[PDB]
Design a protein around this nucleic acid. Sequence first.
RNA 1: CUUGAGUGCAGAAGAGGAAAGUGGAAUUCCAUGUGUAGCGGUGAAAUGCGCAGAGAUAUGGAGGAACACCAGUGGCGAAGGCGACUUUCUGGUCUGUAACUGACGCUGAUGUGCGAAAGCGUGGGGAUCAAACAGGAUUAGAUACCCUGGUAGUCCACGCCGUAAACGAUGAGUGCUAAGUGUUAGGGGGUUUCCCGCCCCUUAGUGCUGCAGCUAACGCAUUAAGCACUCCGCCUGGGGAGUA
Lengths: 88, 71, 96, 68, 117
Amino acid sequence: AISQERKNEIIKEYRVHETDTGSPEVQIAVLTAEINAVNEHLRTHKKDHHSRRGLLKMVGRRRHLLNYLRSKDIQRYRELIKSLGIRR
Amino acid sequence: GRRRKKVCYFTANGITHIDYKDTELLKRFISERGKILPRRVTGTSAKYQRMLTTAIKRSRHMALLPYVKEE
Amino acid sequence: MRTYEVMYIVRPNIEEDAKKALVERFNGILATEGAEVLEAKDWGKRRLAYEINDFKDGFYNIVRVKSDNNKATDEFQRLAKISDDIIRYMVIREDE
Amino acid sequence: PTINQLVRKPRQSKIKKSDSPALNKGFNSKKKKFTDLNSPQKRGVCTRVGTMTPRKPNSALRKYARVR
Amino acid sequence: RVKKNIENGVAHIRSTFNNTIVTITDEFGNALSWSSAGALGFKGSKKSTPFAAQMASETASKSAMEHGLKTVEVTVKGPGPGRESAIRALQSAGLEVTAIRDVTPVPHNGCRPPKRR
RNA sequence: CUUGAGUGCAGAAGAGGAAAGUGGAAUUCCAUGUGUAGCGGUGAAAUGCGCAGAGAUAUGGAGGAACACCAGUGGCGAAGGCGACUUUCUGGUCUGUAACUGACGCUGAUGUGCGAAAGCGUGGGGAUCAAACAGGAUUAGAUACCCUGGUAGUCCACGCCGUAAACGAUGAGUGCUAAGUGUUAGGGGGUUUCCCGCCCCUUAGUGCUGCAGCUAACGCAUUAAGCACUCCGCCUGGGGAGUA
């Protein structure tokens, strides 16, 4: 859907400190999983407008988080985009 | 204001109910004509008012309530 | 991942025990998909608030299931219209 | 407007058009080239003369003529 | 079959703006007898005069009691000004109507009817 | 560094979306049964329906239609619009939250999606409704309208459609600023049995009166049309002509 289960599952790893709430690496992992799920929904919901707008904003915000991870960091970004395979 | 109706009848209920388990509370929720005693003259908050109304309208669709009731 | 309830009105005209086998087989075809079935219960005899075809009486059955969008609501929404001894249904979220 | 869109724009005025189409000789008598001559006067002939009538009460009969 | 003799039928009352078609029925039910206000001389702008409804009710009620009947309900549909007066003169006309039922069953946002007027 | 942003936990939150199914009263049509004599629209009616049953009835369905109340400044939305029920698998709502990387933010040319209705291409439906229409009043003429029926299409599939009063002709976000005074969800404190009962503080919106302010006036006025800020578009008399 997702809920905090898979969220925490995929944040178990990229946390600079395991208590962090910025450092979007784990967060962009969550966003990746969630946009995948909503795209499955979109393939299920062929016509609408909510999935379109939601994917627009979500993927854009995650893109900007990556851009930050490319400006704030230089290796974490790439290592994500090769591991996560998103926003390369 | 505003123009809702009496509350605190939930002294033995709340916050969310029922949906259907007491036909008698629904007897007092809205009118008996099939028409709906409005939130203006029912009272509970639009969250609970809306949920109770969709409960009763389902009961209508559930045949637990008549969609329209005759006399 | 979600939760989903369901009501439905099994009818008085049909045989009570054959319909009982039918509704327990419903409990099967609902729960066997990983559906967190909680309880199914029979209202018993009652005057319908309004009949649909000829059914002055009828029985009700309610289920609670804590499950995603694709275990019971998907499958039985179709297995309900094929269900002919029964007049109607109402699947809902599992919150009451 | 915002400073940036002000920059990427000229804030154009509402410059008028001379309601007197006074295109004087300019390049009329060579190449027939249209030329905005603003001359206060050109020489030329009224090939026809006429007289439209005004309405009442002031029946001040005004006379016209078509000119080149 | 013709006029199904019961002592408690339903007197179906329609009173349009250019007709008052009012009839006796049963709860079974079926139509037995009626009359139209336009049919009864009141015509044109008069096809639904209050006394047109009154006398059409007279016809229908009279036929109802010669069917053999004392009590009767009223299915009062066509919206008219004189149909209620018709009802009153029927109650006083030897009929024992006790269920005054002016019926205008609205559908549930039923399909858009002929609306223009 | 953090609150903004993030996201973090706890909740609260729903006509939001689109797919699917379920019901209902019933437009209309029609089955059956009864039943007239007229229905019929009017000034008269014509017509048009119709005596073999019209108009009407009661029993029965059909199709398609949008869903009787709620409904409200409820709400969702960014709008179009979004209300029968349900689910689909998601989009969004906020209270609190401070979880802590550490500005990650900003509106947004181009681009660009989404999107009343009609119309329409195609392929179906057509239940109404319905232009045109004609019968036909009316009157040489009668579509003029008052009829009767029916009518493209409305309605289903996608496109074309992308347009409107989509209007608040109030771009967005920011944060400040008397009040009274509600709401819609929150929360807290005390208050008391759940204070739910009260009050009050704000959370975030949506009120009415009104400080100041400002508007030609109108009025807003914490939700400013008051104060300011980055970012969009328009407007340039009328109209000519949204038309070429």
